[PDB]
Design a protein around this ligand. Structure first.
Ligand SMILES: CC(=O)N[C@@H]1[C@@H](O[C@@H]2O[C@H](CO)[C@H](O)[C@H](O)[C@H]2O)[C@@H](O)[C@@H](CO)O[C@H]1O
Length: 602
């Protein structure tokens, strides 16, 4: 009978007896010296009940947990596999830091319930090399704290790849640097985290479609139709300046992300029914590639040019599949571009066809999507129906292929104000465990979804998951002060820092890790409803905060209390900007800075 761990082990050879965790147990590193593995092991030692010392000098003994890093095992166990023995001691043998670490993830689960585990052994190597979560941190901003928690959880489930579509605050093109974005130090923090948790980051700037977050202030680069009308999201790929612009932004992003892979998106650009409307793309294609060339040939050539560009710096390219629709009559997509398949239909090239072409193909089905305000992946249905990466949108493969890389779930903010990032974090719990299970490749844990959900809940988040205190103030009434001023209602549903104000606020924690902030004077709730919206969210730096009737569903009325010693800052759950005094008039506005407030019980 195999152990109840998630993902499940690839095989299990059961034995008699049980390993018990005792006070004498040590963590023994009896392979090669590796600082990373040692640091990991010291955290792991503390994640167990009791006081296990970590050592690298002494021989292992019964009762110990032995972490044996043997580089000679790289052929057999790969970069991520391990060999587990649950005997009179526990032994994890791996070739790499990552392999050891994943072994320790299984060990924490084996000992979780009562510090006992039934004996046996397993060679546990992942069935798929890419086991991922994708986060579109686009328009909105997703907190680095939220990402750190996701990365810990991913690691705890042996997920190894985090796709992030996001804007780096640009020095190359400051005209693109409008919120949401990540500063370069924030990106470096993210990179730091991913390295610590054994995760590969896959950053994206979308091109040549979905570029409205970059081209809003470059109308000269926008694609025009036969009537001269610009498509703001779409780069004019007929123009040399367009590739120069895009590759410049890629270069800047790759500098900081420092990733092996670049994902350029390349989803939702054009279909063949539009070709009478883009005769300039047609002319450019035929000038370069002859009488049969299409705008889709130009599209593919643009992608191949980016491929060549990033390969020059040792990088590898990825794209979404949907623009591969059999209309590139002349220009094949370079074979070393990984294709992430999310959708089928019409003449969109089938997974079997992509795989037969020898390219890396990832299953990134829409069915594995979580969309704010929209579709939510139905983990229970996928489990009950034995989904694996063989099951693509529109096509179920009848057997494996070596070049099927794995799978990921994807988190999209399409209706950005409809859901907080903390609600999403809740909703992703079972999706994450399901994709980890389906891509690691062991047998199904229980015949019912119920039992899988029970096992996942029992195991819980990763150790060290929680990295914030979401409830640092007892629900109650508080003055929020800075110097001589307090937060107060002002003219026309405005809120301001008013000198000598005795105004107060009812702060109540919400279910999703925020607070409603309700004026004692007026009875209305602090909200963000003014300024420019993207995806329905109030994302304008400098927008005024205001008061509105309190609502159970307005996510813009939810505030995160970001703490220090004597003070707090208020972060809007949706915009992720902080309440800031506008110097000119004292108005409370939302910015990437913050006004520090002292909460004084009233
Ligand atoms: C590959 C894919 O899923 N494409 C569509 C998604 O489009 C992304 O949308 C985000 C904003 O939410 C951003 O603009 C990004 O650059 C786009 O690729 C997304 O809408 C998804 C979820 O409904 O559906 C797809 O159609």
């Amino acid at each position: 009978a195999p152990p109840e761990v998630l993902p499940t082990l690839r095989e299990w050879q059961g034995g008699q007896g049980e390993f018990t965790l005792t006070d004498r147990a040590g963590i023994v590193l009896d392979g090669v010296r590796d600082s990373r593995t040692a640091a990991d092991a010291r955290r792991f030692a503390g994640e167990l009940n009791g006081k296990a010392s970590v050592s690298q000098g002494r021989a292992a003994r019964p009762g110990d947990i032995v972490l044996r890093q043997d580089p000679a095992q790289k052929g057999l166990l790969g970069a991520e596999g391990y060999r587990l023995t649950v005997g009179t001691r526990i032994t994890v043998t791996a070739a790499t830091s990552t392999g050891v670490f994943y072994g320790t993830r299984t060990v924490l689960q084996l000992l979780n319930d009562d510090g006992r585990a039934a004996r046996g052994s397993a060679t546990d190597v992942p069935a798929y090399r890419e086991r991922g979560v994708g986060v579109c941190a686009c328009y909105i901003n997703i907190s680095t704290q939220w990402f750190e928690r996701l990365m810990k959880d991913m690691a705890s489930q042996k997920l190894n790849q985090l796709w992030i579509e996001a804007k780096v605050k640009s020095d190359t093109d400051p005209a693109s640097a409008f919120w949401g974005y990540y500063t370069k130090p924030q990106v470096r923090t993210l990179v730091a985290m991913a390295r610590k948790y054994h995760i590969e980051l896959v950053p994206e700037i979308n091109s040549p479609g979905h570029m409205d977050t970059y081209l809003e202030n470059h109308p000269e680069l926008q694609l025009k139709d036969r009537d001269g009308v610009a498509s703001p999201p779409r780069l004019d790929i007929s123009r040399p300046e367009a590739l120069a612009y895009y590759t410049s932004m890629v270069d800047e992003a790759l500098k900081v992300w420092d990733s092996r892979y670049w994902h350029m998106g390349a989803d939702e650009y054009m279909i063949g029914s539009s070709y009478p409307d883009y005769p300039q793309l047609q002319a450019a294609a035929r000038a370069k590639f002859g009488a049969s060339a299409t705008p889709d040939d130009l599209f593919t050539d643009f992608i191949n040019q980016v491929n060549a560009h990033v390969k020059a710096d040792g990088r590898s390219l990825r794209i979404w599949n949907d623009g591969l629709a059999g209309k590139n009559a002349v220009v094949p997509l370079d074979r070393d571009i990984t294709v992430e398949h999310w959708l089928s239909g019409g003449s969109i090239q089938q997974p079997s066809s992509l795989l037969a072409e020898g390219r890396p193909v990832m299953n990134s089905a829409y069915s594995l999507y979580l969309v704010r305000g929209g579709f939510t992946m139905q983990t229970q249905k996928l489990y009950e129906s034995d989904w694996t990466p063989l099951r693509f949108e529109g096509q179920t493969l009848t057997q494996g292929a070596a070049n099927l890389t794995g799978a990921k779930i994807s988190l999209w903010p399409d209706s950005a104000a409809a859901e907080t990032e903390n609600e999403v974090e809740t909703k992703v719990f079972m999706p994450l465990r399901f994709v980890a299970q389906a891509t690691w490749g062991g047998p199904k844990p229980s015949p019912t979804y119920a039992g899988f959900e029970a096992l996942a809940r029992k195991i819980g988040h990763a150790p060290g998951w929680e990295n914030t205190d979401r409830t640092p103030l007892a629900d109650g009434t508080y003055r929020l002060t800075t110097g001589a001023k307090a937060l107060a209602p002002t003219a026309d549903a405005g809120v301001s820092l008013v000198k000598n104000s005795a105004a107060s606020w009812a702060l109540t924690a919400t279910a999703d890790g925020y607070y409603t902030v309700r004026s004692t004077e007026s009875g209305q709730c602090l909200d963000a409803v003014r300024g420019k919206k993207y995806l329905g969210a109030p994302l304008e730096v400098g927008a005024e905060l205001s008061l509105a009737n309190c609502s159970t569903t307005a996510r813009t009325q939810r505030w995160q209390l970001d703490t220090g010693a004597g003070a707090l800052t208020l972060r809007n759950a949706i915009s992720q900007l902080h309440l800031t005094e506008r110097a000119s008039d004292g108005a409370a506005v939302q910015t990437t800075g913050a006004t520090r407030l002292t909460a004084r019980a009233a």
